[PDB]
Amino acid sequence: AKYPTLALVDSTQELRLLPKESLPKLCDELRRYLLDSSGLGTVELTVALHYVYNTPFDRLIWDHQAYPHKILTGGHSSTSISAGIGVAIAAAKEDKQRRAVCVIGDGAITAGMAFEAMNHAGDIKPDLLVVLNDNGPGTLFEELGFNYIGPVDGHDVLGLVSTLKNMRDLKGPQFLHIMTKGLPSYSKIFGDWLCETAAKDNKLMAITPAMREGSGMVEFSKKFPDRYFDVAIAEQHAVTFAAGLAIGDYKPVVAIYSTFLQRAYDQVIHDVAIQKLPVLFAIDRAGIVGADGQTHQGAFDLSFLRCIPDMVVMTPSDENECRQMLYTGYHYSDGPCAVRYPRGSGTGATLEPLASLPIGKGVVKRQGEKIAILNFGTLLPEAAAVADKLNATLVDMRFVKPLDTALILQLAGEHDALVTLEENAIMGGAGSGVNEVLMAHRRAVPVLNIGLPDYFIPQGTQEEIRADLGLDAAGIEAKIRDWLA
Amino acid sequence: DIAKYPTLALVDSTQELRLLPKESLPKLCDELRRYLLDSGLGTVELTVALHYVYNTPFDRLIWDVGHQAYPHKILTGSTSISAGIGVAIAAAKEDKQRRAVCVIGDGAITAGMAFEAMNHAGDIKPDLLVVLNDNEPGTLFEELGFNYIGPVDGHDVLGLVSTLKNMRDLKGPQFLHIMTKGLPSYSKIFGDWLCETAAKDNKLMAITPAMREGSGMVEFSKKFPDRYFDVAIAEQHAVTFAAGLAIGDYKPVVAIYSTFLQRAYDQVIHDVAIQKLPVLFAIDRAGIVGADGQTHQGAFDLSFLRCIPDMVVMTPSDENECRQMLYTGYHYSDGPCAVRYPRGSGTGATLEPLASLPIGKGVVKRQGEKIAILNFGTLLPEAAAVADKLNATLVDMRFVKPLDTALILQLAGEHDALVTLEENAIMGGAGSGVNEVLMAHRRAVPVLNIGLPDYFIPQGTQEEIRADLGLDAAGIEAKIRDWLA
């Protein structure tokens, strides 16, 4: 009704029956429809691709998250070309004339794995069309083995249909280039600390793989531009570039999300940890992210970091502890340090003067009887409520690695059971490390590991995810009671 | 002695390399090359030329190579372009005219991180020399932002000195391209199984990020060339390329070393595990590698894989188990499977007909008393000797994930203490998983986790590393006794 040509389509197969001349307004109707729910820049491309390609039989792979494509039919970046090549090879072996296309953005194509994919495509020469949605120029892509066309108007649906119909029938790797158009957050706390530290230390260097702005570095980038390094969507280079700066006797800080740090794992291990280089990792979006665009949960960093020798891992419980730990890691010179904190605001904690925290020592917040709660991170307020309810001991462990071994053994000798709490996978996480300490000393005291379950957490609000997983005060108390039953 | 190397003996006596007359360098290269042969041989001329032109060790020379760079170690007696960029930026801000050079091999430059580094250098433009040692043109590197020189004769030392002299004074990123010239192993078991499987099934596809010395896929690459994919040193693309093939309804097998799988961690999580795609990971060089070449120990895969949901992790104890587990993972359709095995040969175990193993079930090998040993992997013969020594119960656990929870709990109820054994980091490893199970069920039975300690293992032979870490029968027994004292 409000969108006449859009009302006439219920599947992509019917769209291809429409006259070629009706596409321009079909795009406008689609664009305006999206404004009563952002990715509108790909409207014309989406229409042209589905009008030229025999979808869903033909495979269209999108590398942000294109909404127009989902309306007509019914995530980590830079993965489209790689999978697209595999799909293209499978389609060739299938031998049923199935075609493959992949759309990649101007940001995603800066990732190393996109270059690995383009290099491989240039060698084995799959029948694959790569569409670069930007926002000669193709000499680079021609050297990598692609037949390059463009730049073209990414908003001329009829020009795209014609170009795409042509390039769809061509053999080998094809490349089309189009042009289109508490209160403070922990990110703010980190950003303020950055500027504060750089203000009186010319050795500080800040590194981010693409400024999503979520890391809170806009002010720093403008106040200290000569010491701010946006390396594009290149987590691997970000970490090892920092290693080089540390080798040069500078003090690098890598601001990186927990989920995206997974991409730099090998560089953390063999370019930093093995060398004992004092790189400071400021790990944002740790734990439960909620609904932050297309950011996966920071579910695993306490697990995959703590098996690495010579890695310090800190988990602040409020914004003051976060500043203390950033300061501590920045001035720690024996090896790399990680400080992981969640998206969102803290508790309103009083920001105390900065001083290095004793390495590998927790803080007893409340002495109780019978059971002790060992907290790693920002769930401390929830644990505090439970500790008063159950009259339990409560410890802010501060350090996932090195653990406060002496305190763990003392707690085990004065309580009947322990409880560990973390916004991280139970498997291999901070609480698992507590188990290892007790077992190593032959201390058979039962421990309830509370954390993220062993499945990928769907998106939602931080509040309702925490409630669903039993990580609020009520859920933690219930888990303890049932476990002790 | 002087009779052999009169020119080389002059240098090392009083480190006068840069004092030698230009005319003597060709003879010094001959002597150095033959000196190494009497005990990276193709880098002799380059090494001499670099140390003759650059003011080392003040000027920083970084080797990102697939060999030990012995010529460099004699003349002198970080490892990536990324670090060289950081060092170059540090040298510029130091403002003492310090120079940075990086040598990179033709294999190493195929990595995504190398392209990430070259893209960044082309933007901020550091005073850096990159020397490509090609032992298998510049339009590509000039589009990336480098000033390209060559190709040049990598064995013409005088030609290199003259060229390096001019380039050392040029500003911005510089790129010099030089030209130089019955008891099977588990690698053999895997390669034979590939050929066996592909012979009666057209869905299998094998992927490796560069075929390295000691590869088991030589025969497979020749008998099934259209089903073998070498993607160069590109672990990220390898895994996501496999994902695409799986999406195309083929059955991909990724052959990758444990240490190098660290580079594709994010692709395993978000391109494979999250999607539940049935990719089989055949993980070679797991555990103690010894001195394969430039391969680090496979010390962490049982830790960083088992915290990922929907990942099956198997640890064969002999070559028959290895075949059964590859078969099991190949026909497992619900998600990815990983089979990790060490460098070297098996036990001579009888190869039985292939059949999928019950998922998450271990095998009781010996019934004892008081102590029960839970083995994960190829240390089972050592555990068997200990089990007979101490009259202990012995179990081949087979699966690191999912664990045989029922067997763990039953063992804990019939013994006073458990012991776990694995060739992997204790922290977060397979034994750590056993701890988590017992703790979750409130079973206060102590567990001795035996495995790799929390430090990086120095190079050595497999047999002597295992002995030094106490992973032989005698070392295991000593640990148990000391732990029970």
XYZ file of N, CA and C in Angstrom, chain A residues 245-374:
390
model
N 57.296 -1.160 19.059
C 57.432 0.067 19.835
C 58.048 -0.211 21.200
N 57.643 -1.308 21.843
C 58.238 -1.673 23.125
C 59.715 -2.007 22.966
N 60.072 -2.718 21.891
C 61.481 -2.971 21.608
C 62.229 -1.655 21.458
N 61.568 -0.634 20.914
C 62.135 0.690 20.790
C 62.077 1.521 22.049
N 61.785 0.896 23.191
C 61.754 1.572 24.487
C 60.661 2.636 24.556
N 59.549 2.407 23.871
C 58.331 3.172 24.084
C 57.313 2.288 24.794
N 56.197 2.894 25.198
C 55.215 2.234 26.058
C 53.888 2.141 25.317
N 53.674 1.085 24.536
C 52.456 0.993 23.730
C 51.264 0.480 24.522
N 50.087 0.962 24.130
C 48.814 0.517 24.684
C 47.932 0.098 23.517
N 47.519 -1.165 23.505
C 46.658 -1.702 22.458
C 45.234 -1.730 22.996
N 44.378 -0.873 22.446
C 42.954 -0.885 22.756
C 42.248 -1.799 21.760
N 41.642 -2.874 22.260
C 41.091 -3.916 21.397
C 39.943 -4.603 22.125
N 38.907 -4.978 21.377
C 37.795 -5.711 21.967
C 38.201 -7.149 22.270
N 37.558 -7.727 23.287
C 37.824 -9.116 23.649
C 37.623 -10.046 22.457
N 36.487 -9.917 21.771
C 36.191 -10.830 20.673
C 37.190 -10.663 19.532
N 37.575 -9.423 19.228
C 38.525 -9.182 18.150
C 39.958 -9.505 18.548
N 40.269 -9.511 19.845
C 41.579 -9.976 20.285
C 41.821 -11.424 19.885
N 40.753 -12.198 19.672
C 40.900 -13.567 19.190
C 41.688 -13.619 17.888
N 41.618 -12.556 17.080
C 42.328 -12.523 15.806
C 43.829 -12.338 15.974
N 44.278 -11.807 17.113
C 45.687 -11.512 17.342
C 46.332 -12.491 18.315
N 45.715 -13.658 18.511
C 46.161 -14.593 19.539
C 47.615 -15.005 19.333
N 47.985 -15.355 18.097
C 49.342 -15.826 17.841
C 50.370 -14.724 18.062
N 49.998 -13.470 17.802
C 50.925 -12.367 18.021
C 51.108 -12.098 19.510
N 50.030 -12.209 20.290
C 50.144 -12.095 21.742
C 51.126 -13.131 22.272
N 50.997 -14.373 21.807
C 51.805 -15.465 22.343
C 53.268 -15.299 21.939
N 53.536 -15.243 20.634
C 54.897 -15.401 20.136
C 55.600 -14.092 19.800
N 54.873 -12.988 19.639
C 55.504 -11.691 19.422
C 55.602 -10.853 20.691
N 54.871 -11.208 21.747
C 54.837 -10.402 22.963
C 55.217 -11.250 24.172
N 54.414 -12.276 24.468
C 54.617 -13.053 25.689
C 55.976 -13.746 25.688
N 56.322 -14.418 24.586
C 57.610 -15.108 24.511
C 58.752 -14.126 24.733
N 58.614 -12.906 24.220
C 59.662 -11.901 24.339
C 59.588 -11.120 25.643
N 58.546 -11.331 26.449
C 58.366 -10.602 27.704
C 58.326 -9.096 27.461
N 57.726 -8.694 26.348
C 57.659 -7.278 26.014
C 56.510 -6.619 26.773
N 56.748 -5.486 27.452
C 55.688 -4.892 28.297
C 54.662 -4.098 27.497
N 53.805 -4.819 26.781
C 52.669 -4.220 26.088
C 51.465 -4.252 27.018
N 50.731 -3.144 27.075
C 49.505 -3.056 27.859
C 48.315 -3.258 26.931
N 47.495 -4.260 27.234
C 46.286 -4.549 26.475
C 45.079 -4.031 27.247
N 44.377 -3.067 26.662
C 43.138 -2.533 27.221
C 41.987 -3.196 26.471
N 41.349 -4.169 27.115
C 40.417 -5.074 26.453
C 39.002 -4.605 26.777
N 38.368 -3.949 25.808
C 37.002 -3.470 25.935
C 36.022 -4.564 25.509
N 34.733 -4.318 25.761
C 33.670 -5.257 25.388
C 33.939 -6.650 25.949
N 34.552 -6.707 27.126
C 34.778 -7.976 27.795
C 33.503 -8.450 28.481
N 33.307 -9.767 28.487
C 32.121 -10.321 29.118
C 30.888 -10.109 28.263
N 29.781 -9.790 28.926
C 28.493 -9.652 28.254
C 28.417 -8.271 27.617
N 28.360 -8.239 26.284
C 28.347 -6.976 25.551
C 26.939 -6.403 25.468
N 25.939 -7.257 25.301
C 24.582 -6.793 25.066
C 24.322 -6.636 23.581
N 23.727 -5.507 23.201
C 23.405 -5.203 21.806
C 24.228 -3.991 21.382
N 25.471 -4.242 20.983
C 26.379 -3.202 20.509
C 26.671 -3.436 19.030
N 25.666 -3.182 18.204
C 25.819 -3.398 16.776
C 26.051 -4.868 16.486
N 27.211 -5.177 15.906
C 27.559 -6.554 15.574
C 28.798 -6.998 16.341
N 28.808 -6.779 17.653
C 29.922 -7.177 18.504
C 29.548 -8.454 19.244
N 30.331 -9.507 19.035
C 30.120 -10.745 19.765
C 30.560 -10.587 21.218
N 30.098 -11.511 22.052
C 30.393 -11.449 23.474
C 31.882 -11.654 23.711
N 32.419 -10.944 24.701
C 33.788 -11.162 25.127
C 33.864 -12.320 26.099
N 33.625 -13.533 25.601
C 33.333 -14.677 26.453
C 34.555 -15.505 26.836
N 35.708 -15.305 26.191
C 36.781 -16.288 26.270
C 38.157 -15.748 26.649
N 38.332 -14.433 26.809
C 39.687 -13.905 26.965
C 40.337 -14.340 28.275
N 39.572 -14.476 29.359
C 40.174 -15.004 30.577
C 40.609 -16.450 30.406
N 40.051 -17.157 29.423
C 40.456 -18.534 29.181
C 41.698 -18.597 28.299
N 41.653 -17.977 27.117
C 42.757 -18.172 26.188
C 43.981 -17.343 26.550
N 43.834 -16.320 27.395
C 45.007 -15.567 27.831
C 45.743 -16.274 28.964
N 45.017 -16.904 29.888
C 45.660 -17.365 31.112
C 46.451 -18.654 30.932
N 46.290 -19.365 29.816
C 47.163 -20.497 29.537
C 48.501 -20.067 28.945
N 48.693 -18.775 28.690
C 49.925 -18.264 28.091
C 50.916 -17.910 29.194
N 52.135 -18.449 29.179
C 53.127 -18.039 30.182
C 53.454 -16.557 30.087
N 53.768 -15.969 31.244
C 54.258 -14.594 31.336
C 53.212 -13.571 30.900
N 51.934 -13.887 31.086
C 50.838 -12.965 30.809
C 50.169 -12.590 32.125
N 50.104 -11.293 32.408
C 49.358 -10.776 33.549
C 47.954 -10.427 33.075
N 46.941 -10.882 33.813
C 45.544 -10.670 33.443
C 44.806 -10.108 34.652
N 44.247 -8.907 34.501
C 43.563 -8.198 35.574
C 42.107 -7.959 35.194
N 41.221 -8.036 36.189
C 39.778 -7.898 35.994
C 39.232 -6.890 36.998
N 39.147 -5.611 36.628
C 38.642 -4.609 37.573
C 37.169 -4.808 37.893
N 36.804 -4.448 39.127
C 35.426 -4.545 39.591
C 34.669 -3.224 39.524
N 35.367 -2.093 39.425
C 34.721 -0.800 39.242
C 35.673 0.100 38.463
N 35.240 1.341 38.219
C 36.033 2.244 37.388
C 37.302 2.708 38.094
N 37.309 2.740 39.428
C 38.539 3.077 40.139
C 39.564 1.960 39.998
N 39.150 0.719 40.270
C 40.034 -0.423 40.067
C 40.554 -0.479 38.637
N 39.734 -0.074 37.666
C 40.175 -0.075 36.275
C 41.339 0.888 36.069
N 41.243 2.093 36.633
C 42.337 3.051 36.520
C 43.589 2.544 37.225
N 43.433 1.998 38.435
C 44.581 1.453 39.154
C 45.259 0.353 38.347
N 44.469 -0.501 37.693
C 45.048 -1.626 36.967
C 45.693 -1.171 35.664
N 45.086 -0.202 34.977
C 45.745 0.390 33.816
C 47.087 0.992 34.214
N 47.098 1.776 35.295
C 48.344 2.330 35.818
C 49.337 1.222 36.151
N 48.880 0.197 36.875
C 49.758 -0.905 37.259
C 50.365 -1.577 36.034
N 49.533 -1.908 35.044
C 50.043 -2.565 33.854
C 50.953 -1.675 33.033
N 50.662 -0.373 32.995
C 51.475 0.551 32.213
C 52.896 0.642 32.763
N 53.050 0.590 34.085
C 54.357 0.695 34.720
C 54.981 -0.661 35.024
N 54.292 -1.754 34.708
C 54.852 -3.092 34.855
C 55.756 -3.376 33.660
N 57.020 -3.702 33.926
C 58.029 -3.787 32.878
C 58.547 -5.199 32.636
N 58.075 -6.195 33.382
C 58.589 -7.550 33.237
C 57.863 -8.361 32.172
N 56.768 -7.848 31.618
C 56.024 -8.567 30.613
C 54.703 -7.901 30.294
N 53.938 -8.500 29.387
C 52.665 -7.895 28.981
C 51.616 -7.983 30.078
N 50.692 -7.023 30.054
C 49.583 -6.967 30.997
C 48.285 -6.735 30.241
N 47.217 -7.377 30.707
C 45.889 -7.227 30.129
C 44.926 -6.724 31.195
N 44.120 -5.729 30.833
C 43.057 -5.198 31.679
C 41.777 -5.270 30.858
N 40.837 -6.113 31.283
C 39.601 -6.350 30.546
C 38.423 -5.781 31.324
N 37.554 -5.062 30.627
C 36.415 -4.400 31.239
C 35.247 -4.429 30.270
N 34.020 -4.351 30.775
C 32.846 -4.492 29.914
C 32.415 -3.182 29.268
N 31.588 -3.327 28.239
C 30.830 -2.203 27.712
C 29.845 -1.711 28.765
N 29.642 -0.403 28.810
C 28.691 0.196 29.723
C 29.377 0.919 30.869
N 28.550 1.393 31.794
C 29.011 2.215 32.900
C 29.409 1.351 34.094
N 30.114 1.971 35.027
C 30.565 1.331 36.246
C 29.605 1.564 37.391
N 30.163 1.706 38.591
C 29.376 1.822 39.806
C 29.312 3.238 40.356
N 30.054 4.180 39.781
C 30.206 5.482 40.393
C 31.266 5.522 41.466
N 32.185 4.559 41.465
C 33.207 4.484 42.496
C 34.047 5.755 42.523
N 34.498 6.112 43.722
C 35.395 7.247 43.880
C 36.741 6.931 43.239
N 37.202 7.824 42.368
C 38.479 7.646 41.687
C 39.595 8.095 42.624
N 40.335 7.132 43.164
C 41.381 7.391 44.139
C 42.700 7.702 43.446
N 43.650 8.308 44.160
C 44.978 8.517 43.574
C 45.567 7.204 43.079
N 46.345 7.294 42.004
C 46.860 6.104 41.345
C 48.101 5.578 42.053
N 48.204 4.254 42.126
C 49.366 3.597 42.703
C 49.363 2.146 42.248
N 50.554 1.599 42.023
C 50.661 0.237 41.516
C 50.084 -0.753 42.517
N 49.194 -1.616 42.035
C 48.614 -2.657 42.871
C 49.611 -3.802 43.049
N 49.683 -4.406 44.235
C 50.544 -5.586 44.399
C 50.138 -6.693 43.436
N 51.120 -7.197 42.687
C 50.839 -8.144 41.613
C 50.359 -9.463 42.204
N 49.251 -9.973 41.674
C 48.753 -11.276 42.071
C 48.197 -11.349 43.475
N 47.611 -10.262 43.973
C 47.021 -10.236 45.305
C 45.581 -9.758 45.213
N 44.675 -10.495 45.856
C 43.290 -10.093 45.948
C 43.022 -9.292 47.210
N 41.789 -8.800 47.312
C 41.358 -7.970 48.431
C 40.149 -8.625 49.080
N 40.234 -8.851 50.388
C 39.103 -9.361 51.156
C 38.159 -8.192 51.417
N 36.967 -8.246 50.825
C 35.971 -7.199 51.018
C 35.077 -7.457 52.221
N 34.855 -8.722 52.565
C 33.930 -9.077 53.631
C 34.314 -10.452 54.152
N 34.511 -10.563 55.462
C 34.779 -11.853 56.080
C 33.468 -12.460 56.567
N 33.240 -13.728 56.221
C 32.042 -14.450 56.586
C 32.381 -15.806 57.183
N 31.425 -16.732 57.079
C 31.585 -18.077 57.619
C 31.154 -19.118 56.596
N 31.862 -20.249 56.589
C 31.432 -21.458 55.894
C 31.708 -21.428 54.394
N 31.387 -20.330 53.707
C 31.600 -20.250 52.267
C 32.229 -18.909 51.910
N 33.055 -18.924 50.865
C 33.760 -17.740 50.395
C 33.535 -17.573 48.900
N 33.247 -16.340 48.489
C 32.969 -16.003 47.099
C 34.182 -15.266 46.546
N 34.765 -15.807 45.476
C 35.956 -15.247 44.842
C 35.536 -14.615 43.520
